[PDB]
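not sure who needs this but someone in the group chat was asking about Morintide mO1 from Moringa oleifera so here u go. i didnt clean anything up, its just raw.
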Amino acid sequence: QNCGRQAGNRACANQLCCSQYGFCGSTSEYCSRANGCQSNCRG
């Protein structure tokens, strides 16, 4: 976890990706192209 509704609503700008839920990473839940990509996804 790096951001989301669980971290106090932050943003991921490192290498992984956050979404409006509470999880940030690389999996197709926090970082999706058709269902996610809220933070800095893909790079």
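also The longest strand covers residues 17-18. if thats useful
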